[PDB]
Amino acid sequence: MSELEKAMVALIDVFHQYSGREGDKHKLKKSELKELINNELSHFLEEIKEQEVVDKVMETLDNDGDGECDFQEFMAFVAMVTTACHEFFEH
């Protein structure tokens, strides 16, 4: 696959790694999302060490209001970290 195709497949794969852990296998619960961030974005975001921060990220990301992060809502978080990293550097 190209460098873009591989990247797209990795987003799918990572969302599935964390979402199939508990309950709804195709949505991220608070605990799943915290592990995803803490394990998989250590060089991009501060580790979450507080409940308040898990709560807040979920509230930001939860657009349909079910209290979970689904794949659409995950791709939106991906855009805002990727944009953050882009915003960061002068290119």
Ligand X SMILES: Clc1ccc(-c2noc([C@@H]3CCCNC3)n2)cc1
DSSP-derived letter for residue 64 is: S
Contact 14, 32 (CB under 8 A): no
What tokens were used for 88?
A: 């960061």
Closest to 31 in 3D by CA, of 40, 22, 39: 22
Residues contacting a second copy: total by CB under 8 A: 37
| CB of residue 26 to ligand X, shortest distance in Å | 18
| CB of residue 44 to ligand X, shortest distance in Å | 8
Do the annotations mark residue 32 as ligand-binding?
yes
Using the rule CB under 6 A, is 80 a contact of ligand X?
yes
Using the rule CB under 8 A, is 65 a contact of a second copy?
no
